[PDB]
């Protein structure tokens, strides 16, 4: 299969999708918790939920769109960075490691976010997820500025 | 050409640039409805506009600003789960319905969130279009686990 | 290395991993901001740093956003519309013009946005910038198409 293209790639493609799904199951959320608090963007939601009050900002609901913006902000370039690199011919278990820091890190940035753990626990997760991604940028760099 | 390195690929890659534009044109529109309504986000807009009043929030707005960022948290990740998909040898017709009903969904997506469809009619577009990424998205967990 | 599949691949792969790191700029910055302004989205990380009264929105914080929400509707696009692009052997010195001019285009951008400068040279920058996206766009849908 193409998925053999490089080492790195199977490990890569298996971190994404899961990123995927984790976000996903952010939007899944969103959705519960808009239900649930009665806390809708829309007048043509709120109107088949209930009434036009529902139409409404709500606390939680926030915080889950924060969630996922911080998701889009993060995991999204991920999916370049470590397609890119997976195709630079990086140590195998090197490769690996910086695919596995992010899941974990990106994971434990969500559970943080939503589930309200106290200061500076996210912002930890955040910043540990981030490395790798720095890594990956600065080795793509230095590979693309060398062959131009 | 490159572009027939896989059969499914050139049907993904229309599909994928006509959402793309289609994104192109929720931001024209986000545009138009500013000025239009006297909307802007920045006072330097505002004072170029007609005045400092001018800087202020509007309903058509924010409803074309939640569009646009439905379709960051969907489109992109379909960016990334297609283009991969499309090297994992699926069925030609079963990834070009793969890729249709996302693309349908998707349009259909943006005319009932812009257009003010009735409930639950932007919401089923959205589910719609959300099947086939959960599809691709367990079909390329599989493939990436089995290369590990 | 696999970064010469195309002669205009190393180019793209330069401007798409600067854009990026110019984006985790934005974060880093958007950060300081919210250190120095005592503006917090999240009551965990306000009762760390002061108190529940620094749970607030700041125009400055809300500017950062809304350049770093540009970034994510223009950037990300880039990323996947230049990648194809790239593969379609395009004129090296075109596609290397493409690349640059969205380059230019969104530094110069963020540049306008965070320094606050007079319209419309934020609104210039964006349309400069989305003038050779929408040129890639186009010509990946003949590409597709005619694969069909
Ligand atoms: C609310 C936002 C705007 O402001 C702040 C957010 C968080 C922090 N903050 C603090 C603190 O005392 O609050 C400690 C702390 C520690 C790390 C860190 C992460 C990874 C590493 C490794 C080992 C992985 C390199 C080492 C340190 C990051 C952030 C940290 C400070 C300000
Ligand atoms: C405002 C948000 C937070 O809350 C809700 C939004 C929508 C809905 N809602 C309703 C309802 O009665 O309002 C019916 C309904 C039906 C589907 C659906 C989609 C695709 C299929 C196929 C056949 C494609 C599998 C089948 C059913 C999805 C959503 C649906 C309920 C709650
Ligand atoms: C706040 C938002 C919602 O509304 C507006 C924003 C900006 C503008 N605005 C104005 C004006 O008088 O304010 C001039 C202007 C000029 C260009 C442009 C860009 C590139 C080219 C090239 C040469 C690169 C093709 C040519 C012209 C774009 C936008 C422009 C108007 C409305
Ligand atoms: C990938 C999706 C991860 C979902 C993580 C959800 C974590 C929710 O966790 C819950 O958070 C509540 C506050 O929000 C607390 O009151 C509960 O003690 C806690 O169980
Ligand atoms: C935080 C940034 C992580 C550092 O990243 C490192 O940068 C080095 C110098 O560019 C490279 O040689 C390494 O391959 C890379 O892992
Ligand atoms: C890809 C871009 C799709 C644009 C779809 C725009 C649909 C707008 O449709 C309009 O919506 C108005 C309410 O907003 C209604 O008052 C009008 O009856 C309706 O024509
Ligand atoms: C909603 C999820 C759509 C189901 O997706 C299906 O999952 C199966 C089991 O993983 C796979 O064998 C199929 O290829 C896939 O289409
Ligand atoms: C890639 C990151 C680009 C950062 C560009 C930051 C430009 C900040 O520029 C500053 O803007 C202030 C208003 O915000 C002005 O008061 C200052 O005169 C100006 O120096
Ligand atoms: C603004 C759109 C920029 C125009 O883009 C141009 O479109 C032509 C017709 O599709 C193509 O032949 C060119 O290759 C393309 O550069
Ligand atoms: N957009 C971010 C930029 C910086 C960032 O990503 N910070 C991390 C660590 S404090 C975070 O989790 N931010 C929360 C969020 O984005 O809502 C923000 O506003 O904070
Ligand atoms: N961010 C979404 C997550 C869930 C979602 O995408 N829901 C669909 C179907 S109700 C939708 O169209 N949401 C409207 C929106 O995102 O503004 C939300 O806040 O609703
Ligand atoms: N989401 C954009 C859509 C249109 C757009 O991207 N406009 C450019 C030129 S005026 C811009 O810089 N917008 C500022 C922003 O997105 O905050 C908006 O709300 O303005």
């Given at each position: 299969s193409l998925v053999m293209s490089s080492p790195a790639l199977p490990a890569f493609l298996l971190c994404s999708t899961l990123l995927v799904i984790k976000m996903y199951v952010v939007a899944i959320i969103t959705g519960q918790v808009r239900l649930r608090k009665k806390a809708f963007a829309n007048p043509e939601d709120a109107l088949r939920h209930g009434?036009?009050?529902?139409?409404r900002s709500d606390p939680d609901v926030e915080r889950c769109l924060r969630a996922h913006r911080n998701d889009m902000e993060t995991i999204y370039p991920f999916l370049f960075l470590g397609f890119v690199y997976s195709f630079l011919g990086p140590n195998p278990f090197v490769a690996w490691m910086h695919f596995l820091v992010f899941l974990v890190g990106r994971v434990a940035h969500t559970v943080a976010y939503l589930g309200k753990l106290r200061a500076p626990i996210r912002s930890v997760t955040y910043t540990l997820a981030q490395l790798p991604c720095a890594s990956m940028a600065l080795q793509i760099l230095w590979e693309a500025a060398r062959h131009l």
């Open positions: 009434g036009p009050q529902y139409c």
